[PDB]
Amino acid sequence: AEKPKLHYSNIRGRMESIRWLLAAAGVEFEEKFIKSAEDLDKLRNDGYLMFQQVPMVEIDGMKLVQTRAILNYIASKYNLYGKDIKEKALIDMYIEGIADLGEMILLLPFTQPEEQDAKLALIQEKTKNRYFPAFEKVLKSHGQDYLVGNKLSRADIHLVELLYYVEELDSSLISSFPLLKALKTRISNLPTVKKFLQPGSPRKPPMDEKSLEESRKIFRF
Amino acid sequence: AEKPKLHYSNIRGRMESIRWLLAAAGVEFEEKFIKSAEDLDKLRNDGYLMFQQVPMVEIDGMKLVQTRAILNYIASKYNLYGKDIKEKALIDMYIEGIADLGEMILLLPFTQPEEQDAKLALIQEKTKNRYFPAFEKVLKSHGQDYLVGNKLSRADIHLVELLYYVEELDSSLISSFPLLKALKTRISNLPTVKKFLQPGSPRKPPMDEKSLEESRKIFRF
Ligand SMILES: C[C@]12CCC(=O)C=C1CC[C@@H]1[C@@H]2CC[C@]2(C)C(=O)CC[C@@H]12
Ligand SMILES: C[C@]12CCC(=O)C=C1CC[C@@H]1[C@@H]2CC[C@]2(C)C(=O)CC[C@@H]12
């Protein structure tokens, strides 16, 4: 038909969780890579960015900005946001938990090199001492395979995405957390998620020196 | 039903947008004020707080934490989150912009004395040239009295709530936005809002030296 169109640079950044979520719902999409500050300026000058920033997603006849606005729409549309307002409330509480950790991780590669040790240390402590216990507690409490309502929701996808990033930063962090380890395998084995994990998918690589410099120019810092 | 129960200290912080939104929907609520570090850790130890943080609200048999999850639940329950998925996307996009500036203002009194003049200046520039233009544009484009679907939603409440704080910080910032000026008066004259704006309501004051030191000891900074 008309595929969702993703407006971002060729990095993870704030678009990566939208990619995951779209792939987990079986949704094929297109990416229009911003390659320069001039490209970003175009979308601004045209009036397509309500707050002058990307991510912007063209979907279902709307140009959506703001990551949470985009992710909420996809999750509602593709039934990954709970069956009722009470499940939705548990989903929202958990994913906001996930985003707390998610944001520290996203910001890490853009931090000054004379800060990166302490920031990762802060991710280490929060992850082991607080956030991983919270999610393990949830799974232990119901003994079910999904976070909410005994059914795949966005929270499983958001948490597993995050597990792959935690995995890369410090592989020991998940070690004392068995149900988290098992959630990760089971979700990785879902057909849609299995496909996105394959080489050549729109799953993006971690930041490196070259993209960091690309980003400096595009986003002007 | 029960009265919803709000756990927080007697300050605005992250609970204040939840008080506004409950008041606007005409919901009576109870506040159990945290007055020490000990009241807060008791909450933690009793397992009331998923991520060991407030705001927390007891509502409909849940101990909901994370400001966005509480807000989304209340808004959906009281029909303030739009009529359908597409009106929800518009609302989500709007409120996240409103929260981007909202966050600047919320964090402001907690910044170091020597940062505060630059922090304010950034709030003034972003207000004048990015956020107020954005919502003045919305109103001009549809010609209606409300931001979304010609009907009161949470976006009206959160924005007007925000216009009150911008007035505290700099009364001139709104002077060039006649449609924003008019929205505030309409919304403020609404009977739930008018009541919550009266003396002795649950509405909270600006931070002062004393609530700042209270917060240092409760939240520990
Ligand atoms: C604002 C910011 C954080 C504070 C800082 O120190 C430097 C930057 C500049 C790059 C921003 C980043 C935040 C996250 C952004 C938006 C992305 O996901 C792509 C580029 C990146
Ligand atoms: C983290 C923080 C900002 C960064 C900073 O400079 C100092 C603090 C300490 C208190 C936090 C605040 C964020 C907003 C919080 C959660 C409230 O609404 C009440 C207490 C307060």
Domain B1-80+190-208, what fold?
Glutaredoxin (3.40.30)
B215 close to ligand 2 (CB < 6 Angstrom) = yes
Using CB atoms and an 8 Å cut-off, which of residues 127-186 of chain B contact chain A?
130-131, 134
- d(Cα B154, Cα B75) in Å, to the nearest integer? 6
Task: Give the length of chain A.
Answer: 221
What's this structure's resolution in Å? 2.1
> Quick check: B48 contacting A, CB < 8 Å?
no
- d(Cα A134, Cα A54) in Å, to the nearest integer? 31
Q: Are B54 and B15 in contact (CB under 8 A)?
A: yes
Domain A81-189, what fold?
Glutathione S-transferase Yfyf (Class Pi); Chain A, domain 2 (1.20.1050)
The H-or-E segment that residue A123 falls in is helix A116-126
- d(Cα A159, Cα A124) in Å, to the nearest integer? 16
DSSP lists the bridge partners of residue B33 as: B8
Are B97 and A51 an interchain contact pair (Cβ–Cβ within 8 Å)? yes
A110 close to ligand 1 (CB < 6 Angstrom) = yes
Are A69 and B89 an interchain contact pair (Cβ–Cβ within 8 Å)? yes
Are B60 and A134 an interchain contact pair (Cβ–Cβ within 8 Å)? no
Dihedral of CA B96/B101/B102/B104: which sign? positive
Q: Are B52 and B7 in contact (CB under 8 A)?
A: no
Angle between helices A37-45 and A209-218 (to 10 degrees): 40
Structure-determination approach: X-ray
Burial of B61 (0-12, 13-18, 19+ CB in 10 A): exposed
Nearest bound ligand to the CA of residue A110 = 1
Annotated binding site of B: 8, 44, 53-54, 66-67
Instruction: Locate CATH 1.20.1050.10 in chain B.
Output: 81-189
Instruction: Locate CATH 3.40.30.10 in chain A.
Output: 1-80+190-208
The pair of three-digit structure tokens given for residue B73, joined into one six-digit string: 């639940």
Residue nearest to atom 19 of ligand 1 (CA): A13
Q: Which amino acid is at B62?
A: M
> Quick check: B50 contacting A, CB < 8 Å?
yes
Closest chain A residue by Cα to residue B77: A85
- d(Cα B220, Cα B210) in Å, to the nearest integer? 15
Cα of A108 to nearest chain B Cα, Å: 20
Confirm whether residue A8 is marked as ligand binding.
yes
Q: Specify the long-range contacts of residues B205-208, CB closer than 8 Å, at least 24 apart.
A: B205/B12, B206/B12, B206/B109, B206/B168, B207/B11, B207/B12, B207/B109, B207/B110
For strands B30-33 and B56-59, give the pairing.
unpaired
- d(Cα A161, Cα A99) in Å, to the nearest integer? 11
